[PDB]
Amino acid sequence: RPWQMKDLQAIKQEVSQAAPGSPQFMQTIRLAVQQFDPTAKDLQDLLQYLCSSLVASLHHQQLDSLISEAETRGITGYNPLAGPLRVQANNPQQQGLRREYQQLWLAAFAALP
Amino acid sequence: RPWQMKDLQAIKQEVSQAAPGSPQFMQTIRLAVQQFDPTAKDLQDLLQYLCSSLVASLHHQQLDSLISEAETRGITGYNPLAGPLRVQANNPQQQGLRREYQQLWLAAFAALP
């Protein structure tokens, strides 16, 4: 049950005025992420739709650092012998990795301003 | 029939002008809750969506007060040998607990001012 075009259109329109990482944007994006239960691929699509290449790159770097610390510590469900967290989160049998990816994503995007 | 994006986006759209505790806010919240019969999970999602973190924290203080009072006084179907009302309202076969939690939710929201 992935999102459709209308959901993305509404998500972008409702937060057109606000700035990335504002409390309003964080509210709406967090609700979307917690409601649709998407993988990393869909999150990348959503970010490309919402913010430009500059904000995309900044979030990419911040999320790289956050994932770096998180999975360098060691995580309950992460096994580094199978692939990067971006790929484990895309397997529907690793929901723990998917939820960790979602939370790192939202925190990284919130850490912009 | 848990609410999708469209329902919650509407709810926030018409709960934007008014402030928590005002007649309109409570009217809309009570209608939504009485219609969709949401558990504690969906209720917390809706609250995080609507208002700032300060109002959510205030509401949760009031809700903890109400729930503690009710558990001391006694609930019709509350059995504390499995988990708090907080966790007993997530089980779909405990309608009484869920409706009690919804009513305490609405009361705590109405008593903010």
Report the gap between the CA of A36 and the closest CA in chain B (Å).
Answer: 9
Report the residue of B3, B4, B5 to disrupt the A interface, i.e. the one with the largest count of A CBs within 10 Å: B5
Q: Do A32 and B5 touch (CB under 8 A)?
A: yes
Residue B54 makes CB contacts below 8 A (sequence gap 6+) with none
In chain B, residues with a C-beta closer than 8 Å to the C-beta of A31 are 5, 8, 45, 48-49
Cα separation, A11 vs B4, in Å, equals 12
Longest dimension (CA), chain A: 43
A2 CB within 8 Å of a chain B CB: no
Q: Which amino acid is at B35?
A: Q
For chain B, domain boundaries? 5-111
CA geometry: angle A51, A52, A57, nearest 5 deg: 95
Resolution (A): 4.8
Cα separation, A97 vs A95, in Å, equals 5
Q: Which long-range contacts (CB under 8 A, 24 or more apart) does B80-89 make?
A: B86/B40, B87/B40, B89/B39, B89/B40
User: Which CATH superfamily is B5-111 part of?
Assistant: Human Immunodeficiency Virus Type 1 Capsid Protein (1.10.375.10)
In chain A, residues with a C-beta closer than 8 Å to the C-beta of B52 are 23
Report the residue of A31, A46, A106 to disrupt the B interface, i.e. the one with the largest count of B CBs within 10 Å: A31
Longest dimension (CA), chain B: 43
Question: Do residues B5 and A10 lie in contact, with contact meaning Cβ atoms separated by under 8 Å?
Answer: yes
Residue A39 makes CB contacts below 8 A (sequence gap 6+) with A89, A90, A92, A98, A101
Reading the block at residue A65, the tokens are 């650092």
